[PDB]
A paper describes a structure:
On the other hand, Bifidobacterium longum XPK showed no inhibition by ATP. Of note, while the dimer–dimer interface in the SeXPK dodecamer involves residues near the C terminus, the B. longum XPK octamer involves residues near the N terminus. As the donut-shape or four-leaf clover shape-like particles or two-dimensional (2D) class average images were not in perfect symmetry, we further examined whether the assigned symmetries were pseudosymmetry. Some relative random motions were observed between different dimers in both SeXPK dodecamer and B. longum octamer assemblies, suggesting the likelihood of pseudosymmetry in these structures. Comparison between the C-terminal interfaces of free SeXPK and free B. longum XPK structures provides a structural basis for the lack of ATP inhibition in B. longum XPK.
Numbering used by the authors:
A (entry chain A), B (entry chain B): 2 to 807
The structure:
Amino acid sequence: TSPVIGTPWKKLNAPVSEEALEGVDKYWRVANYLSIGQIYLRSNPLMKEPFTREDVKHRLVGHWGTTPGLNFLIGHINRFIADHGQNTVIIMGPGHGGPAGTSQSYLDGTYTETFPKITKDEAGLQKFFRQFSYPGGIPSHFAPETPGSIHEGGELGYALSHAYGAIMDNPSLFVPAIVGDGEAETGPLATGWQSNKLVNPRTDGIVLPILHLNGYKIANPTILSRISDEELHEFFHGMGYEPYEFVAGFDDEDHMSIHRRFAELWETIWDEICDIKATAQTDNVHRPFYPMLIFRTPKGWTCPKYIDGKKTEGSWRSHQVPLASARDTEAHFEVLKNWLESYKPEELFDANGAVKDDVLAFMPKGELRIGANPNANGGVIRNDLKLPNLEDYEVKEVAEYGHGWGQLEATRTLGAYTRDIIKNNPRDFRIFGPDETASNRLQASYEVTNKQWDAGYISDEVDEHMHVSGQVVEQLSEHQMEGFLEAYLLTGRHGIWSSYESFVHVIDSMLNQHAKWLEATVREIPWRKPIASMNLLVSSHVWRQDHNGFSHQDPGVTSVLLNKCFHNDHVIGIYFATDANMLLAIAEKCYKSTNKINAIIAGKQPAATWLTLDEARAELEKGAAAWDWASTAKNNDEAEVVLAAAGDVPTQEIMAASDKLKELGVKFKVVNVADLLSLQSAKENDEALTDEEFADIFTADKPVLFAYHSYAHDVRGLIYDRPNHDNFNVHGYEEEGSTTTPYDMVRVNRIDRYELTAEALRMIDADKYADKIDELEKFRDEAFQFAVDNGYDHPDYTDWVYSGVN
Amino acid sequence: TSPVIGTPWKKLNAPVSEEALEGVDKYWRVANYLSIGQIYLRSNPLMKEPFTREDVKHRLVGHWGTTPGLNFLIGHINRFIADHGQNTVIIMGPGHGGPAGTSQSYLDGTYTETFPKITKDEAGLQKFFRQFSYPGGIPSHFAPETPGSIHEGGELGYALSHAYGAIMDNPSLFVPAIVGDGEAETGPLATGWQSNKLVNPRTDGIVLPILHLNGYKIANPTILSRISDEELHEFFHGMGYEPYEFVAGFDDEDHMSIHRRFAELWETIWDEICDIKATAQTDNVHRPFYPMLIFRTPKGWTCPKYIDGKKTEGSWRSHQVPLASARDTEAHFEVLKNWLESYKPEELFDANGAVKDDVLAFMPKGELRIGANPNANGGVIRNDLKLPNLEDYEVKEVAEYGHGWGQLEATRTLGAYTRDIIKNNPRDFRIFGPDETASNRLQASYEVTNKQWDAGYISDEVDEHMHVSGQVVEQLSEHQMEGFLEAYLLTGRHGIWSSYESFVHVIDSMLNQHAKWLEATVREIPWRKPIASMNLLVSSHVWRQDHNGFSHQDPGVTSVLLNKCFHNDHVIGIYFATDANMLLAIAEKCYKSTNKINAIIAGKQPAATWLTLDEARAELEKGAAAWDWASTAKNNDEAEVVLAAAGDVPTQEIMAASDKLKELGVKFKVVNVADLLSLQSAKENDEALTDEEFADIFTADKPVLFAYHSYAHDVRGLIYDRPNHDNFNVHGYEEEGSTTTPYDMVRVNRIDRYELTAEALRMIDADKYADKIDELEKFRDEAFQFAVDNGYDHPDYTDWVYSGVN
Ligand SMILES: Cc1ncc(C[n+]2csc(CCOP(=O)(O)OP(=O)(O)O)c2C)c(N)n1
Ligand SMILES: Cc1ncc(C[n+]2csc(CCOP(=O)(O)OP(=O)(O)O)c2C)c(N)n1
Ligand SMILES: [Mg+2]
Ligand SMILES: [Mg+2]
């Protein structure tokens, strides 16, 4: 559960003290000095003479155009957290301002705790300076290695979705979400503005969006900064916000005059937020206007105004590095030396090199710190889900009526299971879906919870299962759902989210980024505890898009997921639910797991059930298993072909083809691969099937016919070094489809039962079976003409039931 | 060039006639009847008795929740185009309202022209009804097979970007962009609202956004419909629009009263647009507020109000199909019969079954029609680029100083070439980039054009190369850039767009969709003429992300591009520019091509040049070629290894390793693969290298060491059936990186020169070369410790120049 920390939502009821703002100004100066020492210096952190070009880095990498503004905001937020005792997580949208975050971690004392070799003295300062963006050092962005970070910020557009996710079901947590003005042009964040219509001020926390409007992107100005102030305020008010505006640094006003002004504006905003929270305890049915801060400052605000006669401060020329070579001229080194001395570090550091005590007296202590806040490290919060007994949801008719029974929909079983998980776990488990929960048949959870909706209600003929609080969030944006769930998991909670297969590509970037958060975490960051897994139910898949057609058919999610399987990280799982029982086993395993991205590919269509629960779990631990009840060959020597399958429709076609093969006396084996990554190379993947086990499943000399859900490229690229891999003949999706009957969909991809039987016959003896092969091939065309003439699939195809049903 | 059609931007200066609105109402009724006959009927289109359940489709697929609103808007737009003679292309954002578009194509006469077997009589109406969403029929969405369509609309969020792209450099074209209210929640379209700050009213056309606010998504209401009207107008005004609002169908007002009211509102909006256009001829430096229409209607507006006691009209229950089974009960069939008779088709069709003449008298004729407009079929507009002589831009120093000369940046050559293409082709070629044109070194085009920017200007110390008109558009959104370019090509123009490699994933969906527009076009749609290719310069690639690090390294674009290579469509090209000359040849070939997606992967870093222009073109036509100047073995028999490469950094490492191999007497071959898809299976890909050519390039028995830009999975999945494929040892990206020196980046991926030399030595004789292998392995660690100690890469690595430089 999310803990209550400090004294939440308290008003100051006093002026901001002068001593605190003294401390805030000194903090800002020292944070800018650290952020510059990191970029430029490799030695001599405190500029003991001789300070020469020997002390400067050979290759200057990093960013400065956002760092002083971030340091300003972070120092003021630190004063605020010390004063109010607020439970606060900062989300840094422009993550390229990494030196700001590392300077915070260093100054609040958490960096030395996490990394003991970076001491708080001259040698520790030298190591801290050298390690930024260095061989064998720390990254340039706001990284998982950086304490106090739940968001990398490298790939832009997801500060707001992550903020609204982090506050969900989390009522005491305050999140200032700093948003770059260039990042605000990206598609994800524009729609992430509208997510205050999906949170409740009573049951969820408060997100304060700080638009960091410094006017410029890389080498280009931002649209928001160059439209009129009337337009900007009108725009933010049309999205349910009260815009506040702060402008600074565009004239010669004294720094204290700026710190004081920001203190009054900040306390005004805090009082509006506290009023909203206090009102929500009585009335939470009508939405408030949350304050949001527009923070207009010059880009690179403390750097030299002009360098080489080019406007540097207040321009895009300060984005990455002013003084691109302070190492190769004497004039640029003098500019750099003057820039470092303009902060007066001589008074901010003591003799031994530690930041002076009066510079950090205004700082929060203990669990209130940014790097120490448990919501930033959501693995220490996390507790296991309390799971219902799986046998309660098993489809038992397979156990007595025989394999292949029924016309059930696989995802309804997961719906019931997830409903009871929600029942056992309220306020820790949440279901997201881009308008598609009821189309993936996960609506059984409406028996115990509602869709959280905080826009207007109009009627009850149209607004069923909607409520101002709920455990089902549903907005038509995959970016929103994925950012919500990722921030939900990163804070310590659990969740599933469902989607159409073809639109998972919309978040290929986001998944990639999350994998990079996991790949980095499992490799080099032990102090970050495991978080829950990102569970993605992929349904309404390529083979059954009757209503939509070719635009909704693209199973390429498997390929993008296969690219993140390296160095024994195991941060990826791709599971194929052949039926409801296998889906139960997969979902149980996935809900128990940690630090992974689990894509469970299950169909919503009426499909037969093949396994019992014990059989499903037994197939699960191996990933691939032989179906002894479907095989006609007792041992590996007898079979004239191995028929392997991965996916519900490929499984159905393999089984129907096996029925026809039985009538011709063909001895074959039947294999089902539930988990794709078990087929990976044994030396590469230590949790994949060993080579002996793989050869036992697939006969070394005998041909293997493989029917696969996605593109066959993904199977062939995975088994390349496996034994008997030359004989594998993968049949997968082949970018051929439309709106048409279900048999046609598999016909045009050469994955129907007739084509599979003909493929197996050709693997054995093309000459002996020539007449039967011809008969099958002309039957495919007759059965297509049947669907054209009559509008539905052939009775031979529709009515087929497996021979193993009693 | 974009043609001027009709009489653009003319005011009516008269009331809308009563006869025209009579026609508009009759059109709306007949369009609704056709849109229902398509979904529900397979026979008896005009309901001659006996009209029985025999006449209804077995499987009812399709959508209705948006179709009557679309028919309303389209009929009114048709009256408008007939009256004003406007050059108009409609972009249908909710593309699942396909029956509306097909009903338009049928009613304006273009459908019979394109498809002669769908006549305009009873049999033709029966075929038109049966073919919708049928085996062997037409798709459900607004498809390339549908005349008058440039946008599929299946995957949501790109109606607005496509509209603003279609009007760019196109001053007489009017685009009403119909936007679904659910689609408006998606991330892409939220930022596509802000694209009126990137178009000029003088040089570009006018986009009118029609928000089709029917209140509901699939099974969920929309955020925009449930916020206050004040908020909605404030929101649209903060984005530079004047909101107009129309509300209809929510009471018992007469249909004519609605058509009249809409006529008046539409002419008011048109007069504001015409005022904007006339003002722009004198003043185009200050941005106007373009009108946008908010079209509030009930979802499924003419369907039965209640079915099964559930609110159907004005609800989300009417999204796909009311009466999910009008075939399986008699009551539902009676509901359907009453629904069809409520339009009074008895007076809309004549005896022979044609739509009556007075129903379509108000319709536009000739080139003004939606299905006949040349901007919808942008292949008939298209003309070839006038290309500068390639030899003008060749890097000639390779020809005299020897291969491997220099430290040039490859993309600057493309910058100059593209600059001269822009010079020869203004107002037909355009450069897009998500804030990254100057970071990919394409800024040479600023010598002949400017960045188009129509927000505010503040200074000239920061606003260089910006102008209210230009051929370089640059917004920080990959969705925006890709939609702009796709609508630019679909209208008949040409373009390039550049991006970081890691963020191309942001548009994996969009590329997929465009490939589906091309796969469908090259297979079954001959009447659609070829459009220019989508040219994507992928730069700032994985191997040289010094400033950014792990968050900016993901070369997975190659994998998603490989999934669209089927059935000899050739709609995909993946090219690796090994140096500037190869880049010139690739870019020339790509600019000449049609109906393709060409990803050109080129580095912006200082890299050596290896080929002359003639050599580069000679490598180009084959895709892969042997470097005879780098090989030490004269024939295929002598070589003890083949070193193949694809990519500038892999090429550099192969060449440096070849230098070390030369010192040990190893006989080897050197191969460079410029085009990835030539390595594909010969039987699958008729334009790939034949099997004999492939075996000639790669020795059958000899091991092949392959250094590859992207993940090795993509190489292994492509050569699976090729000869000698067992001996291939692909070395690619392995998700291991950070901010560090360039040698470290290739060190941690086992793709550096030392590791490649050791790999080749192990392929030959591990025992004989054991000491040398050990020496190489410990040198890698020494050269990494050098970078850690000193901050830059080893002199042995940095200073290395190929031995072939004179
Ligand atoms: C989607 C995406 N496209 C491009 C980039 C490359 N990039 C890194 S930083 C940056 C500019 C930062 O813009 P803004 O939000 O205005 O930041 P600030 O002014 O704080 O530097 C860009 C385009 C990215 N990180 N993500
Ligand atoms: C990105 C994306 N996510 C999901 C879908 C699935 N989908 C198809 S139609 C639809 C609802 C249409 O919403 P809206 O724009 O409100 O349309 P309308 O009210 O006109 O039906 C959805 C979610 C999609 N096409 N694209
Ligand atoms: Mg900015
Ligand atoms: Mg809608």
